[PDB]
RNA sequence: GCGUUGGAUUGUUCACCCACUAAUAGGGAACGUGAGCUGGGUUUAGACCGUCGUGAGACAGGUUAGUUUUACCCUACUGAU
């Protein structure tokens, strides 16, 4: 359901975590409240893996994973990929990408069926995405903002975009993603909605200073 | 631990030796020493620089 | 097609904006730190 | 109007329902009710002249079946309470004060905050 | 120094002192930023203060979009050209010094950071990580 | 005990803003310190203006140019036999 937390004192939960339908990744920053905001509302259907990729605690901006695969950038090492492989269900495939745009969670906005991709991605990348995730792509900007994975949080049930999204563009996004959206905000008005919060098909974690009208329109559309 | 390669010459860069250089077109270069780094700065071509791996592979 | 997120009700445009006009009127100040006499 | 239900923030548990929240007429404002009176050490002297706020920042409810074991075990005059499924505080109990956020002395009753506390309609959403 | 910053940074080599005119990396409308001061800098006589990667500075726009210039605004240094040492042994440097206009809380003013961004800058601020395509 | 800044203008001490900072406290040692430096100011001789004087000339008014010397001795201090 709806959950607030903070990583250390920041409300950008999607920066420090990557939640999906099969697993959930978090960073190592203490904060038993931040860990319990997952593991208190989670059964053991999904494993909560603690990892840093390329030494960075910003793992939710540099991984772009699905329910059936995980994309780590070229900067990750062998040891923190082995730690991912030895603690994750084998229905996914941890493929390390080698292309230019290193912030994969920033340039990729994917759920279990469709993937919205930043336009200047390499032509070798989207076919690899459709190989490891079984998912077709759409190389279109949310609203001129070419960073589609941080200005749009997306699940199978609903979507959510930043409030500069034109009404003519929400139609195109809903027709290509086959999913209704809403132009909303998060964390007292932060327009970086794909990074201010993380989502599942049954759990939506939000930053701590979010408001009740923000959580109402998050939980209204992300459950259906 | 991982060993890497010089980008100009093709020498095995060991950890703690050489430099890195992140170009403005978002390409990353490794240099084993200041000779290879300065030959990259002077716009030289590793296919012309005779002692690299590229010269020996192009000249077979 | 948004909501205020402070009071919640009014749908505002996509021209580049914030919470509602009464919300920036009553909650947000930009004239603080002056003596009125 | 329709019925509502008040619940907690950062945790998803239903706290209380409607058919509560007496409005109790917040403003009178003659000389001393709208002023947060702080009496000094002697002579009934009043230093602090603070105007009361306009918004009502507290919920006033009835004793609850979840409140019955806490009221039955180790009863004292004034304390604090919280959610059983969490540890985030929602307020305190008293039968001699803890007036309002607007600040009138009332009958002995349990209060509820609206900071880290929200309210939701019991029926479905309006779906905008 | 900790003005909205996430954690604690190691000592990067001080790349660019006051008076340095670095580029502007985001689409705020500015084009260059003139560094006038560094937040959280120690005072020694005659030592004029210098900014490394990931530092929050106070700066001034010198070119572009006249709504932005002639005022002091906080910036965050996202690229530097002085070669610094990462603790895993690599020395590295970018080809230009470049910063990003932010508020005092650390939240950016633009929407996309063109060009690469150092790891030591992207990690220390969660808003610079959210707006940067290439990291290192 | 330990610290007490970076600048814009001015020869300035003084003052005044800008900005960072834990903080930008007040003073003294021949109003510390020119065989330590600099020479912007003042303070020779050149010249221009304004006022005053019949005039030569005056101005603590404005402006611009204008040589800054010596240690190898004794002590002191720093190191070395
Ligand atoms: Zn409003
Ligand atoms: Zn609770
Ligand atoms: Zn009241």
XYZ file of C-alpha atoms (C1' of nucleotides) and ligand atoms in Angstrom:
669
model
C 0.000 0.000 0.000
C 1.108 3.584 0.595
C 4.295 3.914 2.619
C 6.497 6.846 3.553
C 10.170 6.580 4.503
C 13.525 8.312 4.117
C 16.836 6.791 3.099
C 19.000 8.880 5.395
C 17.111 12.157 5.438
C 16.162 12.327 1.742
C 12.744 11.578 0.296
C 14.036 10.332 -3.065
C 13.267 6.672 -2.506
C 13.510 5.765 -6.184
C 17.087 7.021 -6.217
C 18.195 4.584 -3.518
C 15.853 1.681 -4.280
C 14.537 -0.319 -7.243
C 11.312 -2.218 -6.540
C 9.647 -4.570 -9.022
C 7.318 -7.566 -9.051
C 9.983 -10.262 -8.597
C 12.605 -8.599 -6.385
C 13.549 -5.358 -4.647
C 16.965 -3.704 -4.507
C 18.083 -1.322 -1.754
C 21.327 0.428 -0.842
C 23.441 0.066 2.299
C 22.777 3.164 4.370
C 21.581 1.900 7.726
C 18.104 3.186 8.619
C 16.142 0.223 9.941
C 13.039 2.370 9.350
C 13.993 2.486 5.657
C 14.521 -1.272 5.568
C 11.334 -1.961 7.539
C 9.294 0.178 5.142
C 9.891 -2.700 2.730
C 10.296 -5.797 4.911
C 7.344 -4.974 7.198
C 4.862 -4.758 4.305
C 6.536 -7.554 2.302
C 6.263 -11.288 2.447
C 9.146 -13.356 1.140
C 7.806 -13.578 -2.409
C 10.351 -10.901 -3.343
C 13.915 -10.777 -1.945
C 15.282 -7.509 -0.561
C 18.869 -7.394 -1.824
C 21.335 -4.873 -0.414
C 23.823 -3.811 -3.069
C 25.789 -0.924 -4.523
C 26.668 -0.904 -8.207
C 29.933 0.822 -9.197
C 30.320 1.654 -5.497
C 27.369 4.037 -5.741
C 24.419 4.100 -3.381
C 22.392 5.577 -6.267
C 21.241 2.178 -7.453
C 17.684 3.075 -8.391
C 18.934 5.494 -11.023
C 21.587 3.191 -12.471
C 19.602 -0.051 -12.631
C 16.671 -0.449 -15.010
C 15.184 -3.849 -14.238
C 12.003 -5.759 -14.965
C 10.250 -8.701 -13.382
C 12.302 -11.028 -15.616
C 15.663 -9.283 -15.948
C 18.072 -6.699 -14.541
C 20.183 -4.190 -16.474
C 23.315 -2.996 -14.671
C 25.619 -0.474 -16.421
C 29.144 -0.930 -17.728
C 30.665 0.470 -14.534
C 29.593 -2.338 -12.210
C 32.195 -4.854 -11.116
C 32.238 -8.638 -10.986
C 31.904 -8.976 -7.210
C 28.785 -6.840 -6.776
C 27.251 -8.661 -9.745
C 28.096 -12.026 -8.191
C 26.455 -10.802 -4.981
C 23.391 -9.988 -7.072
C 23.427 -13.387 -8.782
C 23.823 -15.458 -5.607
C 20.854 -13.725 -3.928
C 18.196 -13.461 -6.619
C 15.652 -15.831 -8.204
C 16.770 -17.350 -11.481
C 13.713 -16.251 -13.477
C 15.567 -12.997 -14.175
C 18.783 -12.486 -16.150
C 21.345 -10.022 -14.802
C 22.769 -8.674 -18.058
C 25.416 -5.952 -17.867
C 24.919 -3.337 -20.560
C 27.914 -1.695 -22.260
C 26.339 1.355 -23.921
C 26.986 5.032 -23.270
C 24.139 6.313 -21.067
C 25.269 5.030 -17.688
C 22.152 5.971 -15.678
C 19.886 3.199 -16.898
C 17.067 3.954 -14.471
C 17.152 7.529 -15.719
C 17.089 6.677 -19.428
C 14.722 3.669 -19.257
C 11.145 3.640 -17.922
C 9.984 0.022 -18.012
C 7.252 -2.151 -16.535
C 6.523 -5.812 -17.286
C 5.164 -5.222 -20.808
C 6.360 -1.942 -22.379
C 9.521 0.137 -22.019
C 9.742 3.889 -22.588
C 13.295 4.703 -23.700
C 15.315 7.924 -23.912
C 15.815 8.812 -27.606
C 19.609 8.969 -27.925
C 20.117 5.403 -26.683
C 22.310 3.200 -28.844
C 20.672 1.106 -31.559
C 22.196 -2.063 -30.090
C 20.555 -1.399 -26.720
C 16.806 -1.744 -27.342
C 17.145 -5.137 -29.016
C 19.136 -6.288 -25.979
C 16.333 -4.887 -23.807
C 13.785 -6.900 -25.788
C 16.054 -9.952 -25.457
C 16.525 -9.870 -21.694
C 13.146 -8.369 -20.721
C 10.883 -9.705 -23.495
C 9.522 -6.188 -23.829
C 9.046 -3.816 -26.747
C 10.323 -0.250 -26.575
C 9.014 3.222 -27.380
C 11.732 5.854 -27.976
C 9.598 8.919 -27.057
C 10.260 11.745 -24.493
C 7.633 12.113 -21.703
C 7.273 15.859 -22.512
C 10.497 17.071 -24.051
C 12.152 15.744 -20.898
C 14.367 13.105 -22.481
C 14.955 11.475 -19.068
C 11.907 9.242 -19.166
C 12.741 7.034 -16.182
C 12.893 9.801 -13.590
C 10.004 12.003 -14.734
C 7.626 9.040 -15.073
C 7.014 6.238 -12.579
C 5.248 3.328 -14.225
C 3.536 0.097 -13.187
C 1.237 -2.309 -15.009
C -1.869 -0.972 -13.273
C -1.336 2.766 -13.730
C 1.184 5.446 -14.560
C 2.273 8.810 -13.223
C 4.053 11.696 -14.952
C 5.358 15.154 -14.094
C 2.871 18.067 -14.138
C 4.325 19.708 -17.247
C 2.827 16.871 -19.295
C 0.449 18.232 -21.913
C -3.016 16.735 -22.212
C -2.258 15.937 -25.860
C 0.824 14.030 -24.684
C -0.919 12.027 -21.955
C -3.159 10.609 -24.704
C -0.135 9.441 -26.702
C 1.533 7.986 -23.606
C -1.639 6.104 -22.647
C -2.110 4.776 -26.177
C 1.445 3.482 -26.446
C 1.745 2.144 -22.895
C -1.875 0.798 -22.928
C -2.114 2.163 -19.373
C -3.860 5.259 -17.939
C -1.669 8.002 -16.491
C -2.062 11.153 -14.430
C 0.048 14.301 -14.245
C 0.895 14.383 -10.546
C 3.633 15.493 -8.200
C 5.473 13.915 -5.278
C 7.413 14.925 -2.137
C 5.908 18.374 -1.409
C 6.009 19.300 -5.101
C 9.103 17.651 -6.589
C 8.452 17.070 -10.288
C 11.028 14.240 -10.457
C 8.346 11.654 -9.876
C 10.127 8.536 -11.131
C 12.860 9.146 -8.561
C 10.796 10.582 -5.712
C 8.924 7.303 -5.245
C 9.090 3.623 -6.138
C 6.183 1.335 -6.975
C 5.075 -2.294 -7.315
C 1.786 -3.814 -8.419
C 0.727 -3.879 -4.757
C 3.170 -1.571 -2.927
C 3.959 2.113 -3.445
C 6.732 3.576 -1.308
C 6.878 7.364 -1.181
C 9.080 9.966 0.466
C 8.336 11.007 4.016
C 7.179 14.583 3.402
C 4.544 13.689 0.803
C 1.007 14.933 1.322
C -2.360 13.226 1.558
C -3.574 14.578 -1.850
C -0.341 13.236 -3.341
C -0.775 9.770 -1.823
C -4.474 9.695 -2.725
C -3.748 10.124 -6.436
C -0.782 7.757 -6.224
C -2.817 4.951 -4.645
C -5.875 5.676 -6.784
C -4.178 5.009 -10.102
C -1.391 2.605 -9.163
C -3.780 -0.047 -7.892
C -5.845 0.277 -11.087
C 40.273 -7.011 -8.982
C 40.364 -6.498 -12.760
C 43.232 -5.655 -15.113
C 42.434 -3.238 -17.960
C 44.045 -2.099 -21.222
C 45.601 1.132 -22.432
C 43.405 2.651 -25.126
C 46.197 4.120 -27.272
C 48.957 1.511 -27.101
C 47.428 -1.705 -25.785
C 49.392 -2.208 -22.578
C 47.898 -4.026 -19.597
C 47.080 -1.295 -17.078
C 47.581 -2.527 -13.520
C 45.663 -0.915 -10.622
C 47.135 2.384 -9.489
C 49.120 3.231 -12.635
C 48.194 5.629 -15.408
C 45.269 7.951 -15.931
C 41.691 7.961 -17.152
C 40.137 10.598 -19.384
C 36.393 11.030 -19.821
C 35.816 12.803 -23.128
C 32.953 15.239 -23.669
C 31.219 12.880 -26.095
C 30.931 10.524 -23.062
C 33.704 8.157 -24.139
C 36.218 6.912 -21.572
C 39.932 6.466 -22.304
C 42.649 4.681 -20.323
C 46.339 5.597 -20.513
C 49.158 3.527 -19.037
C 51.655 6.400 -18.908
C 52.198 10.047 -19.782
C 53.829 9.133 -23.116
C 50.652 7.448 -24.356
C 48.485 10.183 -22.825
C 50.507 12.968 -24.484
C 50.533 11.145 -27.820
C 46.746 11.054 -27.525
C 46.762 14.788 -26.711
C 48.869 15.536 -29.815
C 46.146 13.935 -32.040
C 48.454 11.100 -33.094
C 47.122 7.895 -34.600
C 47.936 4.556 -32.903
C 47.854 2.892 -36.332
C 50.855 5.089 -37.206
C 52.615 4.891 -33.821
C 54.908 1.933 -34.357
C 55.298 0.335 -30.913
C 51.589 -0.069 -30.075
C 49.519 -3.215 -30.434
C 47.620 -1.561 -33.307
C 50.704 -1.155 -35.503
C 51.741 -4.781 -35.004
C 48.211 -6.052 -35.679
C 47.731 -3.904 -38.807
C 51.204 -4.845 -40.111
C 50.669 -8.523 -39.103
C -4.973 17.296 -15.525
C -3.436 17.570 -12.058
C -4.414 18.176 -8.441
C -3.212 20.901 -6.053
C -1.386 18.492 -3.636
C -1.837 20.970 -0.766
C -5.612 21.325 -0.620
C -6.211 18.824 -3.412
C -9.216 19.995 -5.411
C -8.407 22.313 -8.384
C -7.105 20.987 -11.694
C -4.408 23.355 -12.937
C -2.651 23.658 -16.267
C 0.598 22.372 -17.728
C 2.079 25.850 -18.283
C 4.542 25.365 -15.427
C 3.045 25.889 -12.006
C 2.711 24.851 -8.363
C -0.150 24.236 -5.863
C -3.381 26.253 -6.050
C -3.759 30.029 -6.134
C -5.347 30.197 -2.691
C -2.609 27.866 -1.435
C 0.197 30.126 -2.675
C -1.887 33.067 -1.418
C -2.335 31.839 2.160
C 0.568 29.432 2.767
C 3.436 30.673 0.581
C 4.957 34.052 1.432
C 7.610 35.929 -0.531
C 7.260 39.162 1.466
C 8.584 37.912 4.803
C 11.420 39.638 6.607
C 10.294 43.268 6.346
C 9.021 45.682 9.030
C 5.677 47.163 7.993
C 6.203 50.267 10.162
C -22.577 14.196 3.322
C -21.077 10.698 3.404
C -19.152 8.914 6.147
C -15.382 9.254 6.599
C -12.602 7.343 8.342
C -9.454 8.737 9.953
C -6.187 6.776 9.747
C -2.470 7.174 10.391
C 0.362 8.422 8.172
C 3.530 6.360 7.318
C 1.504 3.262 8.358
C -1.583 1.701 6.768
C -4.011 0.922 9.597
C -7.583 2.144 10.113
C -7.825 4.126 13.360
C -11.362 5.497 13.694
C -14.625 6.074 11.829
C -17.177 8.903 11.475
C -20.059 9.841 13.836
C -17.546 11.785 15.935
C -15.632 15.112 15.780
C -17.853 17.643 17.561
C -17.204 21.129 16.177
C -17.622 22.622 19.715
C -17.733 26.268 18.436
C -14.012 27.291 18.195
C -14.201 31.157 18.219
C -15.648 33.400 20.903
C -12.909 36.075 21.240
C -13.939 38.575 23.918
C -10.644 39.247 25.722
C -9.066 35.994 26.969
C -10.465 32.945 25.140
C -8.710 33.683 21.840
C -5.479 34.462 23.714
C -3.081 31.732 24.860
C -2.886 32.778 28.512
C 0.363 32.025 30.370
C 0.055 33.080 34.012
C 3.214 34.244 35.782
C 4.472 33.166 39.206
C 2.436 35.749 41.122
C -0.475 38.217 41.017
C -2.351 36.444 38.142
C -0.039 38.287 35.762
C -0.348 37.549 32.038
C 2.767 38.151 29.939
C 2.241 36.192 26.712
C -0.350 37.651 24.341
C -0.659 35.024 21.586
C -3.617 35.069 19.211
C -5.060 31.616 18.596
C -4.710 30.008 15.181
C -7.565 29.764 12.700
C -7.203 26.124 11.635
C -8.395 23.239 13.809
C -5.340 20.994 14.176
C -6.842 18.260 16.373
C -9.468 15.534 16.080
C -11.789 14.943 19.046
C -13.054 11.370 19.334
C -14.723 8.869 21.709
C -13.001 6.081 23.679
C -12.400 3.021 21.526
C -12.276 -0.762 21.912
C -8.585 -0.531 20.987
C -8.276 2.155 23.690
C -9.855 -0.053 26.370
C -6.777 -2.227 27.259
C -4.500 0.831 27.435
C -7.067 2.597 29.634
C -7.413 -0.519 31.803
C -3.699 -1.280 32.249
C -1.627 1.137 34.380
C -3.997 4.101 34.391
C -2.379 7.477 35.074
C -3.472 11.105 34.623
C -1.713 12.123 31.394
C 0.394 10.098 28.989
C 0.785 9.184 25.316
C -0.724 6.656 22.908
C 0.182 5.273 19.485
C -0.823 2.726 16.864
C -0.677 -1.000 17.734
C 0.765 -1.882 14.314
C 3.381 0.889 14.413
C 5.284 3.001 16.944
C 4.515 6.513 15.639
C 2.795 8.641 18.267
C -0.706 9.962 17.624
C -1.205 12.028 20.795
C -1.916 11.594 24.480
C -4.723 11.004 26.944
C -6.016 13.329 29.664
C -9.189 14.004 31.646
C -8.332 17.491 32.959
C -6.882 19.477 30.036
C -4.983 19.205 26.713
C -7.417 21.789 25.478
C -7.409 21.983 21.598
C -5.147 23.490 19.013
C -7.579 26.418 19.106
C -7.444 26.332 22.894
C -10.657 26.049 24.942
C -11.012 24.015 28.121
C -13.520 21.261 27.348
C -15.114 18.163 28.898
C -12.772 15.179 29.590
C -12.265 13.474 26.228
C -9.531 11.839 24.150
C -7.864 13.939 21.463
C -6.300 12.933 18.144
C -3.733 14.842 16.095
C -3.896 15.717 12.422
C -0.131 15.972 12.073
C 1.082 12.521 10.865
C -2.687 11.679 10.721
C -4.911 11.823 7.632
C -8.551 11.229 6.708
C -10.128 9.316 3.824
C -13.689 8.717 2.603
C -14.997 5.245 3.399
C -16.651 4.910 -0.025
C -14.859 4.849 -3.381
C -12.957 7.813 -4.790
C -14.477 10.437 -7.081
C -12.087 9.265 -9.898
C -11.092 12.598 -11.556
C 29.321 22.203 3.411
C 26.397 19.910 4.185
C 23.689 22.072 2.612
C 21.304 19.372 1.454
C 24.195 17.017 0.666
C 23.602 13.322 1.217
C 26.813 12.080 2.807
C 30.470 12.957 3.218
C 32.836 13.222 0.270
C 36.508 12.356 0.177
C 39.020 15.080 -0.557
C 39.019 15.530 -4.307
C 41.891 17.672 -5.599
C 40.781 21.312 -5.559
C 40.313 21.952 -9.226
C 39.085 25.458 -9.673
C 39.384 28.479 -7.369
C 37.238 31.596 -7.100
C 37.055 33.590 -10.287
C 36.878 30.400 -12.337
C 34.289 30.570 -15.096
C 33.051 27.035 -15.587
C 30.471 25.966 -18.126
C 26.829 25.381 -17.293
C 25.752 21.803 -17.868
C 21.956 21.856 -17.465
C 19.226 23.508 -19.525
C 18.604 26.334 -17.085
C 19.274 28.932 -19.771
C 22.668 29.898 -18.390
C 25.850 29.149 -20.280
C 28.722 29.874 -17.889
C 29.011 30.265 -14.126
C 31.507 32.558 -12.415
C 32.541 31.047 -9.079
C 32.632 33.655 -6.326
C 32.775 31.413 -3.216
C 32.659 27.806 -2.053
C 30.316 26.681 0.734
C 32.095 25.099 3.754
C 35.636 26.310 2.875
C 38.325 26.846 5.580
C 39.907 30.276 6.015
C 43.662 30.728 5.713
C 45.334 34.077 5.003
C 45.856 34.669 1.235
C 44.481 31.220 0.390
C 41.685 31.982 -1.964
C 39.108 29.209 -1.786
C 38.840 26.453 -4.349
C 36.087 24.092 -5.437
C 36.439 20.423 -6.256
C 34.041 18.002 -7.915
C 30.679 17.741 -6.205
C 31.121 20.957 -4.217
C 28.320 23.449 -3.723
C 29.494 26.931 -4.694
C 27.952 30.365 -4.907
C 28.256 31.587 -8.463
C 26.989 34.128 -10.955
C 25.731 33.707 -14.513
C 27.860 35.632 -17.002
C 26.096 34.792 -20.277
C 22.575 34.019 -21.418
C 18.899 34.478 -20.417
C 18.904 37.921 -18.682
C 16.369 36.747 -16.099
C 19.239 34.750 -14.566
C 22.265 37.020 -14.513
C 23.225 39.825 -12.087
C 22.347 37.668 -9.069
C 24.150 35.199 -6.816
C 22.873 31.634 -7.014
C 24.118 28.271 -5.736
C 25.741 25.857 -8.160
C 27.146 22.330 -7.937
C 30.398 21.385 -9.670
C 29.722 18.301 -11.796
C 32.880 18.164 -13.968
C 36.433 19.344 -13.361
C 39.599 19.254 -15.447
C 42.107 18.843 -12.627
C 43.106 15.196 -12.422
C 42.028 13.667 -9.121
C 42.619 10.284 -7.531
C 39.896 7.811 -6.790
C 40.666 5.567 -3.834
C 40.514 2.499 -6.097
C 43.671 3.862 -7.728
C 42.519 5.455 -10.976
C 43.382 9.050 -11.768
C 40.902 10.783 -14.033
C 39.900 14.166 -15.387
C 37.245 15.561 -17.681
C 37.884 17.904 -20.588
C 36.041 20.886 -19.099
C 34.906 22.323 -15.797
C 31.138 22.443 -15.592
C 28.534 23.138 -12.940
C 24.775 23.021 -12.459
C 22.524 25.700 -10.940
C 20.673 24.433 -7.858
C 18.731 25.826 -4.912
C 20.298 25.883 -1.409
C 18.516 22.603 -0.602
C 20.377 20.855 -3.433
C 17.434 20.530 -5.818
C 18.316 21.505 -9.363
C 16.726 24.234 -11.460
C 17.127 22.649 -14.892
C 15.794 19.367 -16.183
C 18.629 17.522 -17.967
C 22.407 17.572 -17.529
C 24.102 17.347 -20.914
C 27.427 15.549 -20.827
C 28.952 13.167 -18.295
C 28.851 13.682 -14.538
C 31.399 12.458 -12.015
C 30.442 9.676 -9.627
C 31.615 11.723 -6.642
C 29.168 14.465 -7.647
C 26.245 12.229 -8.590
C 26.416 10.233 -5.361
C 26.542 13.192 -2.970
C 23.312 14.734 -4.309
C 20.227 12.627 -5.129
C 18.858 15.338 -7.435
C 21.959 15.488 -9.647
C 21.718 11.709 -9.960
C 18.109 12.011 -11.107
C 18.901 14.467 -13.912
C 22.149 13.097 -15.378
C 22.304 10.734 -18.329
C 25.964 9.715 -18.382
C 27.688 9.093 -15.050
C 31.496 9.264 -15.376
C 45.112 27.031 24.992
C 43.688 27.687 19.888
C 41.764 30.342 15.674
C 40.044 35.117 13.797
C 39.190 34.984 5.973
C 38.401 35.733 0.313
C 37.107 40.192 -2.575
C 34.702 45.433 -5.434
C 36.171 51.137 -4.781
C 39.912 54.307 -2.434
C 47.191 55.860 -1.446
C 44.438 55.498 2.407
C 44.713 54.224 8.585
C 39.289 54.746 8.758
C 34.800 53.616 6.323
C 31.503 50.903 3.087
C 29.248 46.957 0.744
C 29.624 41.392 -1.486
C 30.444 36.315 0.184
C 31.993 32.173 2.867
C 32.674 30.796 7.852
C 32.603 28.169 14.237
C 34.048 33.376 14.169
C 35.389 37.108 10.776
C 37.168 40.438 18.840
C 39.966 44.781 20.528
C 44.906 46.217 21.226
C 50.598 46.707 22.139
C 55.791 45.967 21.003
C 60.176 53.804 19.053
C 51.620 55.307 16.935
C 56.391 46.985 15.970
C 58.714 46.488 11.403
C 62.322 51.098 4.567
C 71.421 48.702 5.236
C 63.291 44.072 5.056
C 60.565 45.599 0.457
C 57.295 48.921 -2.242
C 56.828 54.298 -3.338
C 50.314 54.814 -4.313
C 50.235 59.565 -0.534
C 53.006 63.517 1.535
C 57.422 66.795 0.874
C 62.207 70.146 -3.542
C 63.124 71.521 -8.603
C 59.061 70.819 -14.534
C 53.786 72.046 -15.993
C 48.095 73.058 -16.121
C 43.599 74.970 -13.828
C 40.604 77.742 -10.098
C 40.655 81.640 -6.369
C 43.824 85.625 -4.236
C 47.831 89.591 -5.473
C 49.516 95.537 -9.502
C 53.503 92.111 -9.499
C 57.295 88.541 -8.179
C 54.457 84.927 -6.183
C 50.696 82.127 -2.333
C 47.051 78.069 -1.501
C 47.409 73.260 4.567
C 42.844 73.391 -3.106
C 42.503 70.042 -7.649
C 45.908 67.328 -11.543
C 50.233 65.027 -13.914
C 55.644 63.617 -14.154
C 59.593 63.082 -10.351
C 67.657 58.566 -8.493
C 64.932 55.038 -2.007
C 72.510 54.146 -0.974
C 76.329 50.493 2.474
C 77.094 45.214 6.227
C 82.788 42.075 5.118
C 82.771 44.512 11.793
C 80.438 43.570 17.410
C 76.210 41.287 19.557
C 71.598 38.576 18.807
C 69.452 34.549 16.126
C 69.923 30.375 12.760
C 72.755 26.286 11.612
C 78.452 24.107 11.754
C 83.322 22.747 13.757
Zn -4.910 24.534 -3.210
Zn 1.168 3.488 12.327
Zn -10.853 23.966 17.883
